[PDB]
């Protein structure tokens, strides 16, 4: 038998709706005529060892499995291996997410969930950069309804970037796919020294403030990532060097709203370092003014006291706030968060300040929050100016 021909398409098998594509077939040196057939369609597509078949515009009618075979002076050759030309610019795009977070431990395993609103779809995960066969749910097929597909991704080695895109297809037309989903980058966190995340605008933020979270490292990282726990994507800024060795990057989050209230961790890496450093200490950003329920701050014994007495600030509310927080004007440390306790019709939290000293003096305000979102606080209480006397 003559060497069975080979079949390849440039630029690739997956071609968008409208984009041009040419399929090539390679046979023997003395080949007389090349014939490109299509599973389903007897008509040959389009038309000494290299023969091309060009398609000006990829349409749903050219999306299928093709096989080639050349005629020789002694007869016809073996049919070629099939090539699935796919049109991937049709159905609306699905949604790719990561479970549990975009950041994974190096060498760890995770799950990427692809999903669409309608049913009857078979999903395919394509890792950007790797020339692999389209990963279909059919290998682990499950009767679910076609709404979602869970793809287990793993071991996430840090030798390269892990970027993914998802498509879906109806079973009747297996070579006509949807629009590529928005890509997802997976970050392999490791054991390198952690950076430090420092807010520059106070503990509790009020709507309108320009939050700027500064990330910094002494090890000399070159690129920094900020991730708010619960999000699908992250922010990346390069690390400038104000001093030799010290590398810092300011993540200007801008005006604040409900979305800016959460826990942020920063990771540091290098242009050549695909892997990322251990996470930084969390920076919980608390957002005031997000609850219209009110809190009240009272001081017992009184706003006026003498050094050495027992002052117990009481933050109370008729609403069932899960926790009560305390802030002192001027202090940069996070607010003192204590749980609520039902007393005389009002839930409360006692912030004991005994014995009181000259340092305890100042303006105090209390807030209240629920455990549904522990970062969305209430409006501040009316200030209380504790005045201590020697």
């Amino acid at each position: 038998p003559f060497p069975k021909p080979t079949l390849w398409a440039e630029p690739g098998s997956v071609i968008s709706w409208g984009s041009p594509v040419t399929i090539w077939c390679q046979g023997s040196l003395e080949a007389q005529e090349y014939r490109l057939d299509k599973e389903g369609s007897p008509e040959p597509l389009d038309r000494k060892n290299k023969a091309r078949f060009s398609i000006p515009s990829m349409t749903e009618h050219h999306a299928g499995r093709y096989r080639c075979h050349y005629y020789s002076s002694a007869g016809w050759s073996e049919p070629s291996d099939p090539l699935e030309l796919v049109m991937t610019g049709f159905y609306n795009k699905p949604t790719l997410s990561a479970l549990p977070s975009p950041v994974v431990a190096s060498g760890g395993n995770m799950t990427l969930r692809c999903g669409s609103q309608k049913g009857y779809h078979h999903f395919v995960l394509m890792k950007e950069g790797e020339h692999q066969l389209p990963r279909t749910l059919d290998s682990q097929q499950l009767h679910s309804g076609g709404f979602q597909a869970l793809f287990p991704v793993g071991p996430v080695n840090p030798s390269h970037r892990w970027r993914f895109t998802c498509y879906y297809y109806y079973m009747n037309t297996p070579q006509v796919w949807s629009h590529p989903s928005d890509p997802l980058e997976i970050l392999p966190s490791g054991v390198s020294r952690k950076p430090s995340l420092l807010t520059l605008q106070g503990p509790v933020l009020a709507p309108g403030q320009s939050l700027t979270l500064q990330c910094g490292s002494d090890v000399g990282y070159d690129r920094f990532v900020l991730y708010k726990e619960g999000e699908r994507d992250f922010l990346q800024r390069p690390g400038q060097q104000p001093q030799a060795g010290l590398s810092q990057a300011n993540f200007t989050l801008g005006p604040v709203s409900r979305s800016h209230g959460g826990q942020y961790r920063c990771y540091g890496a290098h242009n050549l370092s695909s892997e990322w450093s251990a996470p930084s200490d969390p920076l919980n950003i608390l957002m005031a003014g997000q609850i219209y329920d009110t809190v009240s701050l009272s001081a017992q014994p009184g706003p006026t006291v003498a050094s050495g007495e027992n002052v117990t600030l009481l933050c109370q509310s008729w609403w069932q706030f899960d926790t009560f927080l305390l802030t002192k004007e001027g202090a940069a440390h996070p607010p003192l968060r204590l749980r609520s306790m039902y007393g005389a019709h009002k839930y409360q939290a006692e912030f004991p300040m005994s014995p009181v000293t000259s340092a305890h003096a100042g303006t105090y305000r209390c807030y209240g929050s629920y455990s549904s979102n522990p970062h969305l606080l209430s409006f501040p209480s009316e200030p209380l100016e504790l005045m201590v006397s020697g």
């Binding site: 479970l99 499950l142 679910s144 309804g145 709404f147």
Partner: protein
């Protein structure tokens, strides 16, 4: 068709119980109990359906028309089977998602589950109606 319809009814009611997604359901959804119960209820429905088809086939008294009708009946049966299988697979996927979420079930996840379950329930209803009508014409 009373028997197969009664089994179908039990499946449907258990599915509504799951649709509520109350704390009891939530905890059972992570332990396979719900899925296995649904599987039992759908196996009964399918067995009984086939039994009813067989007994109706005895009562029957042209050939191509009859063959076509039998083909249609088989197609409808398969559809119902596939729909219940879909429901159960969607419930196994929810378990897996909660596990990949390290045991945490968000409200968003559950809202999506509910949305998908309502969509699978409508299909089941339509297919059931069609099957009943086909049994009638048979």
């Amino acid at each position: 068709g009373q028997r197969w319809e009664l089994a179908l009814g039990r499946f449907w009611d258990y599915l509504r119980w799951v649709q509520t997604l109350s704390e009891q359901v939530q905890e059972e959804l992570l332990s396979s109990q719900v899925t296995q119960e649904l599987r039992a209820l759908m196996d009964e429905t399918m067995k009984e359906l086939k039994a009813y088809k067989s007994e109706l086939e005895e009562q029957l008294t042209a050939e191509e028309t009859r063959a076509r009708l039998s083909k249609e009946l088989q197609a409808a049966q398969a559809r119902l089977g596939a729909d219940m299988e879909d429901v159960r697979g969607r419930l196994v996927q929810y378990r897996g998602e909660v596990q990949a979420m390290l045991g945490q079930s968000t409200e968003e996840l559950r809202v999506r589950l509910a949305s998908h379950l309502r969509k699978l329930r409508k299909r089941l209803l339509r297919d059931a109606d069609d099957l009943q009508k086909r049994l009638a014409v048979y």
